[PDB]
Amino acid sequence: HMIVLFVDFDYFYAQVEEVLNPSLKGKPVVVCVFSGRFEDSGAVATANYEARKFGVKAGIPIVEAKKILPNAVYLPMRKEVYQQVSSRIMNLLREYSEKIEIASIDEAYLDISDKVRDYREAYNLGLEIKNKILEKEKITVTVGISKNKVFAKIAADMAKPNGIKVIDDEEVKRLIRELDIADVPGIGNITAEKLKKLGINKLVDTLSIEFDKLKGMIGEAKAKYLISLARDEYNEPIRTRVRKSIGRIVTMKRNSRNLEEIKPYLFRAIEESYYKLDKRIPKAIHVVAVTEDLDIVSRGRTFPHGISKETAYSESVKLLQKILEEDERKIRRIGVRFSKFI
DNA sequence: TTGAATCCTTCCCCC
DNA sequence: GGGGGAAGGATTC
Ligand SMILES: Cc1cn([C@H]2C[C@H](O)[C@@H](COP(=O)(O)OP(=O)(O)OP(=O)(O)O)O2)c(=O)[nH]c1=O
Ligand SMILES: *[C@@H]1O[C@@H]2Oc3cc(OC)c4c5c(c(=O)oc4c3[C@@H]2[C@H]1O)C(=O)CC5
Ligand SMILES: [Ca+2]
Ligand SMILES: [Ca+2]
Ligand SMILES: [Ca+2]
């Protein structure tokens, strides 16, 4: 049938800060985003493996990370740059099979189904690709290879970092039963729990229960996706994809409810969101507000025409007025999301 | 100074 | 009953 190749860049942001300043290598590096809330306020975007050995990983507040590795290099995240270094690497890949996906700023799938005859020749295209990326951009990436996207990615997860691994149909059969289901692409612990207290702890356990008992627990989508993976009928194609939305959320010094105190933050967001749109006209706008207790509340409005900057400002303030009206908590983070492009 | 994509469940129109 | 679709959430990486 087919052979899907998965490329995923190792500790990407951290590594981009490394390549851009070689001195950092071998030393713990932690890329984080400081919110002016107070000093060291913020979380950790990511950390190279040095720091990651000792517990410092993406998500933990940076204060907790500084109590663990008070002498690691902490750097502010610069998205724009990573973005370009990604785009660059995402082209060297187009040169191995126009059938490319691109799941994120660091993940992409290739259907080298035609450029290769056997897995063995795949392991070769794998090293070729790794090698070309390492020479041209100085970045280390892991490669996964199998019969379909899901497993191609599982291969990469098993070979991180700077790894290469193929999973043939014998491993798949094996993994269908032995591979812990919580380690399957698309099963956040929230779904890993509903599955746990339902009998399904392995990919194969999904065949046991009735289909409409799943459809009512985890939804139809997750249910069909899982069964097809369990029965070995998963065969999703590698489809190119486009950004279906652009936004920006900002943290405020203090939590408040005063429209006049939040407005300016909301504009900064609206202002940057349009810079990101570049040459695109959106038709729907959303204002998301992160409550004082870290809960998300949003409000939208779709127009029959595009949204000009002036109407985004105006329409954004009403939606906000509607959020405070329908909620009681104080706002912490505020932002906008522009979708449904022209 | 941090995204963004699916999927879902609910609601409202109307043939 | 069923096709449409907009919306405010739920979930995942
Ligand atoms: C998890 C996470 C990722 N990111 C971004 C930064 C990273 O470079 C990239 C996410 O990490 P991942 O791309 O999922 O994995 P990684 O390769 O960078 O990590 P690993 O060392 O396991 O190989 O996405 C954030 O900004 N915040 C987060 O909380
Ligand atoms: C949404 O707000 C934070 O900002 C980001 C940005 C990410 O990538 C650019 C990101 C990723 C992941 C994640 O779990 O969170 C974020 C976040 C935070 C979210 O709370 C991933 O698994 C991959 C990228
Ligand atoms: Ca990744
Ligand atoms: Ca990665
Ligand atoms: Ca998981």
Coordinates of C-alpha atoms (C1' of nucleotides) and ligand atoms in Angstrom, one line a residue:
Chain A
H1 CA 0.0 0.0 0.0
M2 CA 1.5 3.3 1.2
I3 CA 4.3 4.5 3.4
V4 CA 3.9 7.7 5.4
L5 CA 6.9 9.7 6.7
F6 CA 6.7 11.9 9.7
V7 CA 9.1 14.7 10.5
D8 CA 9.1 16.5 13.9
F9 CA 11.8 18.9 15.1
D10 CA 13.4 18.4 18.5
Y11 CA 12.7 21.0 21.2
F12 CA 12.3 23.5 18.4
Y13 CA 12.1 26.9 20.0
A14 CA 14.9 26.1 22.4
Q15 CA 16.9 24.7 19.6
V16 CA 16.4 27.7 17.4
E17 CA 17.8 29.9 20.2
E18 CA 20.7 27.5 20.2
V19 CA 21.5 27.5 16.5
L20 CA 21.2 31.3 16.7
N21 CA 23.8 31.4 19.5
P22 CA 25.9 28.2 19.5
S23 CA 27.4 29.0 22.9
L24 CA 24.1 27.9 24.5
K25 CA 24.5 24.3 23.4
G26 CA 25.1 21.6 26.1
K27 CA 23.8 24.1 28.7
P28 CA 20.3 24.1 30.0
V29 CA 18.1 26.5 28.0
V30 CA 14.5 27.4 28.8
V31 CA 12.4 29.4 26.4
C32 CA 9.7 31.2 28.3
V33 CA 7.1 33.9 27.9
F34 CA 7.2 36.5 30.7
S35 CA 3.8 38.2 31.4
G36 CA 4.3 41.6 33.1
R37 CA 1.9 40.4 35.9
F38 CA 5.0 40.5 38.2
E39 CA 8.6 39.3 38.1
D40 CA 9.2 35.9 36.5
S41 CA 5.5 35.8 36.0
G42 CA 4.6 33.4 33.2
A43 CA 5.0 29.9 32.0
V44 CA 7.6 27.9 30.0
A45 CA 7.1 27.6 26.2
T46 CA 9.8 24.9 26.1
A47 CA 13.2 23.6 27.2
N48 CA 16.0 21.8 25.5
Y49 CA 16.8 18.4 26.9
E50 CA 19.5 19.5 29.3
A51 CA 17.0 21.3 31.5
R52 CA 14.3 18.8 30.7
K53 CA 16.3 16.1 32.5
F54 CA 15.7 17.8 35.8
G55 CA 11.9 18.4 35.5
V56 CA 11.9 21.8 33.7
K57 CA 9.3 21.2 30.9
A58 CA 6.8 23.2 28.9
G59 CA 3.9 24.6 31.0
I60 CA 5.4 24.7 34.5
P61 CA 5.5 28.3 35.7
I62 CA 8.9 29.8 35.3
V63 CA 9.2 30.5 39.0
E64 CA 9.0 26.8 39.7
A65 CA 11.6 26.3 37.0
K66 CA 14.0 28.8 38.6
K67 CA 13.8 27.0 41.9
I68 CA 14.8 23.8 40.1
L69 CA 17.6 25.2 37.9
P70 CA 18.4 28.6 39.2
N71 CA 21.4 28.7 36.8
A72 CA 20.0 27.7 33.4
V73 CA 19.7 30.2 30.6
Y74 CA 16.2 31.7 30.5
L75 CA 15.2 33.4 27.2
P76 CA 12.1 35.3 26.0
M77 CA 10.3 33.6 23.2
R78 CA 10.5 35.1 19.7
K79 CA 7.8 33.5 17.6
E80 CA 8.4 35.4 14.4
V81 CA 11.9 34.0 14.0
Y82 CA 11.0 30.4 14.7
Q83 CA 8.2 30.9 12.2
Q84 CA 10.7 31.7 9.5
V85 CA 13.1 29.0 10.4
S86 CA 10.2 26.6 10.2
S87 CA 9.0 27.8 6.8
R88 CA 12.6 27.4 5.5
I89 CA 12.8 23.8 6.7
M90 CA 9.2 23.1 5.5
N91 CA 10.5 23.7 1.9
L92 CA 13.5 21.3 1.9
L93 CA 10.7 18.8 2.6
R94 CA 8.6 19.8 -0.3
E95 CA 11.6 18.5 -2.3
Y96 CA 11.0 15.0 -1.2
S97 CA 7.3 14.7 -2.0
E98 CA 4.7 17.4 -3.0
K99 CA 2.3 15.3 -1.0
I100 CA 3.0 17.1 2.3
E101 CA 0.7 17.9 5.2
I102 CA 2.2 20.3 7.9
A103 CA 0.5 19.7 11.2
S104 CA 2.2 22.6 13.0
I105 CA 5.1 24.9 13.3
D106 CA 7.3 21.8 13.7
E107 CA 5.3 18.8 12.4
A108 CA 4.8 17.7 8.8
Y109 CA 3.7 14.5 7.1
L110 CA 4.9 13.2 3.7
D111 CA 3.4 10.5 1.4
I112 CA 6.6 9.3 -0.1
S113 CA 4.4 6.4 -1.0
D114 CA 5.5 6.8 -4.7
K115 CA 9.1 7.8 -4.3
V116 CA 9.9 4.5 -2.4
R117 CA 9.4 0.8 -3.0
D118 CA 10.1 -0.7 0.4
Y119 CA 10.4 0.3 4.1
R120 CA 14.2 -0.3 3.8
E121 CA 14.5 2.3 1.1
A122 CA 12.3 4.5 3.4
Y123 CA 14.8 4.3 6.3
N124 CA 17.2 5.7 3.7
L125 CA 15.1 8.6 2.6
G126 CA 14.7 9.2 6.3
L127 CA 18.4 9.6 6.9
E128 CA 18.7 11.7 3.7
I129 CA 16.1 14.1 5.0
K130 CA 17.5 14.3 8.5
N131 CA 21.0 15.0 7.0
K132 CA 19.8 17.6 4.6
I133 CA 18.0 19.5 7.3
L134 CA 20.9 19.3 9.7
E135 CA 23.3 20.7 7.0
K136 CA 21.1 23.5 5.6
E137 CA 19.5 24.7 8.9
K138 CA 21.5 23.1 11.7
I139 CA 18.4 21.6 13.3
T140 CA 18.0 18.0 14.6
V141 CA 14.7 16.2 13.8
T142 CA 13.2 12.8 14.5
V143 CA 11.6 10.8 11.8
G144 CA 8.8 8.2 12.0
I145 CA 7.8 5.8 9.2
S146 CA 4.8 3.5 8.8
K147 CA 1.6 2.7 6.9
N148 CA -0.4 5.7 8.0
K149 CA -0.1 9.1 9.7
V150 CA -1.1 7.9 13.2
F151 CA 1.6 5.3 13.4
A152 CA 4.2 7.4 11.5
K153 CA 3.8 9.9 14.4
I154 CA 3.9 7.2 17.0
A155 CA 7.2 6.1 15.6
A156 CA 8.6 9.6 16.1
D157 CA 7.3 9.6 19.7
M158 CA 9.2 6.4 20.4
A159 CA 12.4 7.8 18.9
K160 CA 12.8 11.3 20.4
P161 CA 15.1 13.1 20.0
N162 CA 17.2 13.1 16.9
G163 CA 15.9 9.6 16.2
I164 CA 14.7 7.6 13.2
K165 CA 12.3 4.5 13.4
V166 CA 10.2 2.4 11.2
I167 CA 7.1 0.5 12.4
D168 CA 6.1 -2.4 10.1
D169 CA 2.8 -4.3 10.2
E170 CA 4.1 -6.7 12.8
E171 CA 4.8 -3.9 15.2
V172 CA 1.4 -2.4 14.4
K173 CA -0.5 -5.6 15.3
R174 CA 1.6 -5.8 18.5
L175 CA 1.0 -2.1 19.3
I176 CA -2.8 -2.4 18.5
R177 CA -2.9 -4.4 21.8
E178 CA 0.1 -3.6 23.9
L179 CA 0.4 0.1 23.2
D180 CA -1.2 2.1 26.0
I181 CA -4.2 3.9 24.5
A182 CA -3.4 7.2 26.3
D183 CA -0.3 7.3 24.1
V184 CA -2.4 7.5 20.9
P185 CA -2.5 10.8 18.9
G186 CA -5.6 12.6 20.1
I187 CA -6.3 11.2 23.5
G188 CA -5.7 13.9 26.1
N189 CA -6.0 12.5 29.7
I190 CA -9.6 13.8 29.6
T191 CA -10.5 11.2 27.0
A192 CA -7.9 8.8 28.5
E193 CA -10.0 8.9 31.7
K194 CA -13.5 8.4 30.1
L195 CA -11.8 5.5 28.4
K196 CA -10.2 4.2 31.5
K197 CA -13.4 4.0 33.5
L198 CA -15.1 2.3 30.5
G199 CA -12.9 -0.8 30.1
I200 CA -10.8 0.5 27.3
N201 CA -7.1 0.7 28.3
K202 CA -5.7 -0.7 25.1
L203 CA -6.4 0.1 21.5
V204 CA -8.0 -3.3 21.0
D205 CA -10.4 -3.0 24.0
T206 CA -12.4 -0.7 21.7
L207 CA -13.9 -3.6 19.8
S208 CA -15.4 -5.0 23.0
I209 CA -18.0 -2.4 23.8
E210 CA -20.9 -1.4 21.6
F211 CA -20.5 1.5 19.2
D212 CA -23.3 3.6 20.6
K213 CA -21.9 3.4 24.1
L214 CA -18.7 5.0 22.8
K215 CA -20.5 7.6 20.6
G216 CA -22.3 8.7 23.8
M217 CA -19.1 8.9 26.0
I218 CA -16.4 10.3 23.7
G219 CA -18.4 11.4 20.7
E220 CA -18.8 9.8 17.2
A221 CA -15.5 11.2 15.8
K222 CA -13.1 9.8 18.4
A223 CA -15.1 6.6 18.4
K224 CA -14.8 5.9 14.6
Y225 CA -11.2 7.1 14.6
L226 CA -10.3 4.6 17.3
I227 CA -12.2 1.6 15.9
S228 CA -10.6 2.0 12.5
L229 CA -7.2 2.2 14.1
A230 CA -8.1 -0.8 16.2
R231 CA -9.3 -2.9 13.3
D232 CA -6.4 -1.6 11.1
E233 CA -8.7 0.4 8.7
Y234 CA -7.1 3.8 9.4
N235 CA -6.0 5.2 6.1
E236 CA -6.3 8.9 6.2
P237 CA -4.7 10.8 3.3
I238 CA -1.9 13.4 3.5
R239 CA -3.9 16.6 2.6
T240 CA -2.2 20.0 2.4
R241 CA -3.9 22.4 4.9
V242 CA -4.6 26.1 5.5
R243 CA -4.8 28.4 8.6
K244 CA -8.5 28.8 9.3
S245 CA -8.0 31.5 12.0
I246 CA -5.6 34.0 13.5
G247 CA -5.7 35.7 17.0
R248 CA -3.8 37.1 19.9
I249 CA -4.4 37.0 23.7
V250 CA -2.7 39.3 26.2
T251 CA -2.3 39.2 30.0
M252 CA -3.2 42.3 31.9
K253 CA -1.1 43.7 34.8
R254 CA -4.1 43.4 37.1
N255 CA -7.4 41.6 36.9
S256 CA -10.3 43.9 36.5
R257 CA -13.9 44.5 35.2
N258 CA -13.7 48.1 34.2
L259 CA -14.3 48.3 30.5
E260 CA -12.0 51.4 30.3
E261 CA -9.2 49.4 31.9
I262 CA -9.5 46.4 29.6
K263 CA -10.2 48.1 26.3
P264 CA -6.6 49.1 25.6
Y265 CA -5.4 45.5 26.0
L266 CA -8.2 44.5 23.7
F267 CA -7.0 46.9 21.1
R268 CA -3.3 45.9 21.3
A269 CA -4.6 42.4 20.5
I270 CA -6.9 43.5 17.7
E271 CA -4.0 45.6 16.3
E272 CA -1.5 42.6 16.3
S273 CA -4.2 40.3 15.0
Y274 CA -4.5 42.4 11.8
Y275 CA -0.7 42.5 11.4
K276 CA -0.8 38.7 11.4
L277 CA -3.7 38.6 8.9
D278 CA -1.3 40.4 6.4
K279 CA -3.5 40.3 3.3
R280 CA -6.5 38.5 4.6
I281 CA -10.1 39.7 5.3
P282 CA -12.0 37.8 8.0
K283 CA -15.8 37.6 8.2
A284 CA -16.2 36.4 11.8
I285 CA -14.6 37.9 15.0
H286 CA -14.4 36.5 18.5
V287 CA -13.4 38.0 21.8
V288 CA -12.1 35.5 24.3
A289 CA -11.6 36.4 27.9
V290 CA -9.7 34.4 30.4
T291 CA -11.4 34.7 33.8
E292 CA -9.5 35.3 37.1
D293 CA -9.8 31.6 37.9
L294 CA -8.3 30.5 34.5
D295 CA -11.6 29.7 32.7
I296 CA -12.3 30.8 29.1
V297 CA -15.3 32.8 28.0
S298 CA -15.7 34.0 24.4
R299 CA -18.3 35.8 22.3
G300 CA -18.6 36.2 18.5
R301 CA -20.4 37.6 15.6
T302 CA -20.3 36.7 11.9
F303 CA -20.9 39.3 9.2
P304 CA -22.0 38.9 5.6
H305 CA -19.0 40.9 4.6
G306 CA -15.4 41.2 5.7
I307 CA -14.4 43.0 8.9
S308 CA -12.4 46.2 8.5
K309 CA -10.0 47.3 11.4
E310 CA -12.5 50.0 12.4
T311 CA -15.4 47.6 12.7
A312 CA -13.3 45.1 14.5
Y313 CA -12.5 47.7 17.2
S314 CA -16.2 48.7 17.6
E315 CA -17.7 45.3 17.3
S316 CA -15.0 44.0 19.7
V317 CA -16.1 46.3 22.5
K318 CA -19.8 45.3 22.3
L319 CA -18.9 41.6 22.6
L320 CA -16.7 42.4 25.6
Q321 CA -19.6 44.4 27.2
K322 CA -21.6 41.2 26.5
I323 CA -19.0 39.1 28.3
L324 CA -19.0 41.1 31.5
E325 CA -22.8 41.2 31.3
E326 CA -23.1 37.4 31.1
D327 CA -20.3 36.7 33.6
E328 CA -19.4 37.8 37.1
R329 CA -15.7 37.0 37.4
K330 CA -12.9 39.5 36.9
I331 CA -11.1 39.2 33.6
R332 CA -7.4 38.2 33.6
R333 CA -6.4 37.7 29.9
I334 CA -8.2 39.3 27.0
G335 CA -7.9 38.8 23.2
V336 CA -9.4 38.3 19.8
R337 CA -9.7 35.6 17.2
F338 CA -10.4 36.3 13.5
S339 CA -11.7 33.4 11.5
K340 CA -13.9 32.6 8.4
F341 CA -11.7 34.2 5.8
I342 CA -12.8 35.8 2.6
Chain B
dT1 C1' 4.3 39.4 24.9
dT2 C1' 2.3 32.7 23.6
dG3 C1' -1.7 29.5 19.8
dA4 C1' -4.9 27.1 16.8
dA5 C1' -7.6 23.1 14.8
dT6 C1' -11.6 19.5 15.5
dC7 C1' -15.3 18.1 17.4
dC8 C1' -19.7 18.5 20.1
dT9 C1' -23.9 19.7 21.9
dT10 C1' -27.6 23.1 21.7
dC11 C1' -30.7 26.2 19.3
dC12 C1' -33.3 28.2 15.7
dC13 C1' -35.5 28.2 10.7
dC14 C1' -38.0 26.2 7.7
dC15 C1' -39.6 22.8 4.1
Chain C
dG1 C1' -38.1 14.3 10.3
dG2 C1' -33.9 16.5 8.5
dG3 C1' -30.6 19.9 6.1
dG4 C1' -28.3 24.5 7.5
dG5 C1' -25.8 26.8 10.2
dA6 C1' -24.3 30.0 13.8
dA7 C1' -22.5 29.9 18.7
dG8 C1' -20.3 29.1 22.9
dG9 C1' -17.7 25.0 24.8
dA10 C1' -14.7 21.0 25.3
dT11 C1' -10.3 18.9 24.1
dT12 C1' -5.9 18.2 22.1
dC13 C1' -1.1 19.2 20.7
Ligands
LIG1 C1 3.8 22.3 24.8 C2 4.1 23.7 24.2 C3 4.7 24.0 23.1 N1 4.9 25.2 22.6 C4 5.6 25.3 21.1 C5 7.1 25.5 21.5 C6 7.9 24.3 20.9 O1 8.9 24.5 20.3 C7 6.8 23.5 20.2 C8 6.3 22.4 21.0 O2 6.8 21.4 21.5 P1 6.6 20.1 20.6 O3 6.8 20.6 19.1 O4 5.4 19.3 20.6 O5 7.8 19.2 20.9 P2 9.3 19.7 20.9 O6 10.0 18.9 19.9 O7 9.6 21.1 20.8 O8 9.6 19.1 22.2 P3 10.5 17.8 22.4 O9 11.8 18.2 23.2 O10 9.7 16.7 23.1 O11 11.0 17.3 21.0 O12 5.5 24.2 20.3 C9 4.6 26.4 23.3 O13 4.8 27.5 22.9 N2 3.9 26.1 24.5 C10 3.6 24.9 25.1 O14 3.1 24.8 26.2
LIG2 C1 -2.9 28.4 24.6 O1 -2.1 29.5 25.2 C2 -0.7 29.2 25.4 O2 0.1 29.5 24.2 C3 0.5 28.3 23.6 C4 1.2 28.2 22.4 C5 1.5 27.0 21.8 O3 2.1 26.8 20.6 C6 2.6 27.9 19.8 C7 1.0 25.7 22.6 C8 1.2 24.4 22.1 C9 0.8 23.3 22.9 C10 0.1 23.5 24.2 O4 -0.3 22.6 24.9 O5 -0.1 24.8 24.6 C11 0.3 25.9 23.8 C12 0.1 27.2 24.3 C13 -0.7 27.6 25.5 C14 -2.2 27.3 25.5 O6 -2.7 27.3 26.8 C15 1.1 22.0 22.3 O7 0.8 20.9 22.6 C16 1.8 22.3 21.0 C17 1.9 23.9 20.9
CA3 CA 5.7 18.1 17.7
CA4 CA 8.8 18.9 17.9
CA5 CA -2.1 11.7 25.2

